[PDB]
Amino acid sequence: LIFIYLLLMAVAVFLVYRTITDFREKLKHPVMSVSYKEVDRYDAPGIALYPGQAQLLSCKHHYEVIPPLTSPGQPGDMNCTTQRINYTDPFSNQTVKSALIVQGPREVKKRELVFLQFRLNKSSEDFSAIDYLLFSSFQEFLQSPNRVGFMQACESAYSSWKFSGGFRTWVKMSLVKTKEEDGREAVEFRQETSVVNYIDQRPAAKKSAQLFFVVFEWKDPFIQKVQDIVTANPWNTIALLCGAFLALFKAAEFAKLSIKWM
Amino acid sequence: LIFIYLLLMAVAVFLVYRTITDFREKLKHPVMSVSYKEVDRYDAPGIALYPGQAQLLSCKHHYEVIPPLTSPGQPGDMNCTTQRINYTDPFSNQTVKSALIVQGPREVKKRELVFLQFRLNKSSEDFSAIDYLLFSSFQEFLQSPNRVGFMQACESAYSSWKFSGGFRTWVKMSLVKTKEEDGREAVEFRQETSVVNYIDQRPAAKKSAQLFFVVFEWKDPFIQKVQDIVTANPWNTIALLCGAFLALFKAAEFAKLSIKWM
Amino acid sequence: LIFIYLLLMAVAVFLVYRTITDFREKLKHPVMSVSYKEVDRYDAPGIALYPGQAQLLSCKHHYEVIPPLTSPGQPGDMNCTTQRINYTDPFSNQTVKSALIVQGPREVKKRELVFLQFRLNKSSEDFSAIDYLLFSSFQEFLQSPNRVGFMQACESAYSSWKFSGGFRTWVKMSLVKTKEEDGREAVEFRQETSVVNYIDQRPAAKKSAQLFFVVFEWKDPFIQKVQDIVTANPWNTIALLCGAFLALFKAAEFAKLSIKWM
């Protein structure tokens, strides 16, 4: 009887250590749940182009699925809500980096895409490109005090991309919102590029001026919500341990009935 | 005694609240499990190219790892199971969009890749590209009645890509199958592009005709099965709650022994 | 009384069956936990370029954020720890594939990037590119016996990429470490390309020699640790089941009190 009681107590202690260690492990490695919430119209995204010396020639919201034939090389109709700012980025506070903010397409369901055009007069770069950062809401920037702070924060909160000459980078930008355990939800942008070579036959002259193109489009109406989940909470652990403790008490009590039997 | 009994009852009520709220939460945010099932030979994938005015010049299944030297510009050997169809997409039912379906490589382990060539006679598009959609099984399309319905369904069930001129888009297409809770398993295609500029020195004449190239390849023999998991089920919850309720009953009964002691 | 006892026994049998089945299911589909561990300085990555006939012209570690103006076409300063090897890959053991290993950037926080230049004398390929494989630690290769075995293993442990002519493939290489249940942690590279067309105006002569460019950079200081988790372990299952068994015993005993009542 004493032997089996000691065995049961050893099982209980082993189980307590077991569950405590398993709870410690399950707190370090929370599992993630990713859910897609279809959205009919995305909030106006903010595209932070950094033209530098480049000159915008045209910007439009092509509600259609395919851009129409344009008139490249010369200035064209401007039909975008473009905001311009000059600030100093925190990572290179010494230098001032001028940006150029544009309002991206909203009608994702209707396949609305904003097509841009840029041009740069002859220079000696030999690797010409225009950076661009994407942030979730353009209106939020358009109505936020101290735009310099907002842009500096975005410089850290978003990674740097770019597009180059003789190309039409068709950036199918998409959202992925991350929720950290503290409750706040950070929003990050995913985007897949598809470079489309520019057939420069139309000028066919000594113009030969760097011409850039981009088509910012919403990949699909799904917003990928990614949130970490803590699979282990002390509540379930304590309930399970109490159930096991009672399970052991009943076995010990049945040992007394066995003693009476013998 | 009454005070401790009321305390135990309050613990029971607040704990059943705990568990019911947590269970309600755990249905909303199911956790995901991703498993890779190595496959020796993928099912013949269906590549739905939309040449438009472009003219296919060559299509082959290069069992080797590297394409050999070709004869660009002029028609070449055709060695692909190409299916042609004209239909109207649901999103643009007004217009008729002609497709061109091809049978992709199967021998993933052997690094089998299907290399295509397209050509377009001089036009005034100025951004020339050929769309292409990928669907899981080409034979399923080749033996399914009402191909128009199948293609229209695919137009919604797969995203739109394309490749452009003077390029060799080496699309390393890969599979990712999703299982929704209802039981059906939707299949989606992932594919990473690697644009390879075309060195057009060979013609070096007034031909200067848009020439496209693509190399559809299976990235690896792994099919990424993604399935959502409901971490919480009512019966684990009810068992845990019953264990906790018994654990509370035993404490209340030990309170009677304490009363006898005092 | 016998009817309710049989009902309780049937419930117990159903519950044990269901718990065993659910434990069997939860062992097949383990859930994954992905954690990002910020790293100040990545270990020197090993870039296994396969120039073939191409001739390296320059390699440098640009601690700045932007490459400076270069002197394309002619040999330049070489400031990289380049290792050269010729071996035979397992998949094509018949042929010998010569590689060229380079020491990649380490100072991720400083936006340190290694910029390379390659050149190929006139050939008849018309699709010119240089393959490159990424492996986690360059020093590990630099101090490992039988480098041929290391390279052959990497040929299977990493996928094949490449960059082409007239381009500056800005490969923002990033790390993702996978832990299989056995305990070993396989390391894989994710990398997103951004092709930047090369404006070849500077030579403007009959040189017209294939020039390749690449900028290998660390995307961000986060290492994506991906590890599978077994949500079900026999120990929780047995504790829950025996707690439910006790919950059944107490109900059966309350049935006796009900009998006494009636």
Swiss-Prot record, chains A, B, C:
It is a multi-pass membrane protein. GO terms for cellular component: cell surface; chloride channel complex; plasma membrane. One of its GO terms (biological process) is chloride transport. It is found in: Cell membrane. Its main location: membrane. Keywords: Cell membrane, Chloride, Chloride channel, Glycoprotein, Ion channel, Ion transport, Membrane, Phosphoprotein, Transmembrane, Transmembrane helix, Transport. Residues 17-232 are extracellular. One of its GO terms (molecular function) is pH-gated chloride channel activity. This is Proton-activated chloride channel. The gene is PACC1.
